[PDB]
Ligand binder design. Structure first.
Ligand SMILES: Nc1ncnc2c1ncn2[C@@H]1O[C@H](CSCC[C@H](N)C(=O)O)[C@@H](O)[C@H]1O
Ligand SMILES: O=c1[nH]cnc2c(O)c(F)c(-c3ccc(F)cc3)cc12
Ligand SMILES: [Cl-]
Ligand SMILES: [Mg+2]
Length: 213
C-alpha cells in the first residue's frame, strides 16, 4: 500500500463518519506522528479558514486535491448550496479524495475532477457550467501557478474580487507567480506568513485579489 492509502485507512479507523473536524484531526495526527504528507495542514489551514469565512464564496476551485485534506477543510465551511470543484491529475489520489469526502459527508458539496488543471480549466464554462469563480486555491505544483492564473484570466473565469489563495509561496516557493501578482495592477496582494505543514520551517500563503483587466 501507499502512504495515501494509509492516510485514508487511518481516517476510516480513527474519525467519525460525517464529522469533518474529526477527519482533519485524524489526518493531522497521522501526519505528525507517523508519516509527513503535503496536506496544507493546521497552521496554514487556520489562515485558510479565516479567508473562507471572510468571503463566504459560492464557488471555489482547488488546484491539487491529494488526499482531500484541504477540500474537507474548505467544504466544511461552505454555506448551503455553495460548491467546490477540485482538480487532481493523479487518478489514485482522485479516488482517495473522493473516498475522504464521502467519509466526511461532504460529497454533495464537492466535485473531484480527475485531470490536469491546464486541460480542465478551459472546459469549466461549457462542460461544467461555470460562469466565474469566487475563489481559487492554488496548491498543485509550483511551476503551474503563474501559467494557470493567466489561463484562468484568458478563459474569463475571474471577476472583480475573485480571491486567489496560493499555498507554498515560500517552500517550495513560487517566485514567478509572486513577482507577477505583486507587480501587477490587476491584483491586490497580501502575504500570510506561517509554517510548512507539520514542520518548524517557515512557509506562507499569498492572497491575490483580482481587480479586472
Ligand atoms: N497540473 C496539475 N493539475 C492537477 N493536479 C495536479 C497538477 N500537478 C500536480 N497535481 C496534484 O497536486 C497535488 C498537490 S498536493 C495537494 C494538497 C491538498 N491541496 C491539501 O492541502 O490537502 C498532488 O496530488 C498532485 O498530483
Ligand atoms: O508539490 C506540492 N504541491 C502542493 N503542496 C505542496 C506542499 O504543501 C509542500 F509542503 C511540498 C513540499 C514537499 C517537500 C518538501 F521538502 C517541502 C515542501 C510540496 C507541495
Ligand atoms: Cl501544521
Ligand atoms: Mg501545499
Amino acid at each position: 500500500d501507499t502512504k495515501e492509502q494509509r492516510i485514508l485507512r487511518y481516517v476510516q479507523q480513527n474519525a467519525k463518519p460525517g464529522d469533518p473536524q474529526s477527519v482533519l484531526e485524524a489526518i493531522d495526527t497521522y501526519c505528525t506522528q507517523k508519516e509527513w504528507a503535503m496536506n496544507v495542514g493546521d497552521a496554514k489551514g487556520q489562515i485558510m479558514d479565516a479567508v473562507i469565512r471572510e468571503y463566504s464564496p459560492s464557488l471555489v476551485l482547488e488546484l491539487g486535491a491529494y488526499c482531500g485534506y484541504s477540500a474537507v477543510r474548505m467544504a466544511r465551511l461552505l454555506q448551503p448550496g455553495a460548491r467546490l470543484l477540485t482538480m487532481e491529475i493523479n487518478p489514485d489520489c482522485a479516488a482517495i479524495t473522493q473516498q475522504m469526502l464521502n467519509f466526511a459527508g461532504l460529497q454533495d458539496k464537492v466535485t473531484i475532477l480527475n485531470g490536469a488543471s491546464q486541460d480542465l480549466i478551459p472546459q469549466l464554462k461549457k462542460k461544467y457550467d461555470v460562469d466565474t469563480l469566487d475563489m481559487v486555491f492554488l496548491d498543485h505544483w509550483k511551476d503551474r501557478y503563474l501559467p494557470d492564473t493567466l489561463l484562468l484570466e484568458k478563459c474569463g473565469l475571474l471577476r472583480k474580487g475573485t480571491v486567489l489563495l496560493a499555498d507554498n509561496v515560500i517552500v517550495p516557493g513560487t517566485p514567478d507567480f509572486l513577482a507577477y501578482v505583486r507587480g501587477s495592477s490587476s491584483f491586490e496582494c497580501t502575504h500570510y506568513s506561517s509554517y510548512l505543514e507539520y514542520m518548524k520551517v517557515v512557509d506562507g500563503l499569498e492572497k491575490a485579489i483580482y481587480q479586472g483587466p
